[PDB]
């Protein structure tokens, strides 16, 4: 899961 | 009568500058005024094209900040078609207009997780970058490149592009949202590199700015990120309160496109550590959210949870899901998930499967290399 930019 | 293609062009550029500043009201006002003047000339296509491009951008911002579209039964979004209108007339435009077209189209493809598309568009924009006059525009571009590379785990390039954007944003008055976001990017990359000490620091500065800005999107997102960082460290229990808090903020102000991701990590956690009842409760909420937000991808990921924990383990389903992610260039999620799966098979009796999945991870890293 990737960060919420 | 003062108004002329040149008169409105300047007004449009002014309009753009407020968009970049995330200042919704000024933008709205300028847009409305500008629309009226446009209606008046009726004369020139390109000016209208410029307007359309800006409106597209304008909407990207609204969608981000107060995205939520508690759905009037049927007026939407202008995003889908506006994309259409511009797409229809893309040959008409050169110079700065060509840059904007590609840049904004890149931005859209980026939030659809069409990372391949996004990056091509961006490269194309980059070429036309010589037509860009002010330094903040370069900054926006750097910021977007950074964001895209982050999603692709191109850590060096992501981080370095964040630096470039930061330097330009910092020297400017009212770009706290983008500064906040740069910190997020710095942190999320540090997280990739395992540099937790740095990551935390940045996550936190980011969050702190989020509060000063009072923007629900960013608050939720910053919180989610802190929790993500905890989770990354395998310290699951500590991640929960940070996720829950983020959910509350996203729900509170109806930030629907953000909700699916939120639910997902929390959900995985509970199952992980055995608290199943909460798991289904979160799962259902998140599956439901991903439909409402039309996040088919997250929907599939939630199904994947189902696929693994219950009915444990639906290998054919897992394999399918991985092929999907792979064919969609979604290598980072693929890597994480492959890991979860291998570990999960390891704590359970049998290593045939776990070894195979660990082997899949290394493959994926080598492959993950190819891009740009």
Residue numbers in the entry:
A (entry chain C): 44 to 48
B (entry chain A): 3 to 374
Manuscript text:
In Bacillus, the Rap protein family modulates complex signaling processes mediated by two-component systems, such as competence, sporulation, or biofilm formation, by inhibiting the RR components involved in these pathways. The second subgroup, comprising RapC, RapF, RapG, RapH, and RapK, blocks the action of the target RR by a direct interaction with their DNA binding domain, and works as an anti-activator. For Rap proteins, regulatory peptides are called Phr and their mature active form is a penta- or hexa-peptide generated from a ∼40 amino-acid precursor by means of a post-transcriptional export-import process. As previously disclosed by the crystal RapF structure in complex with the DNA-binding domain of its RR target ComA, RapF was an all-helical protein consisting of two domains: a small N-terminal 3-helix bundle domain (residues 1–68) and a large C-terminal TPR domain (residues 98–370), both connected by a linker region (69–97).
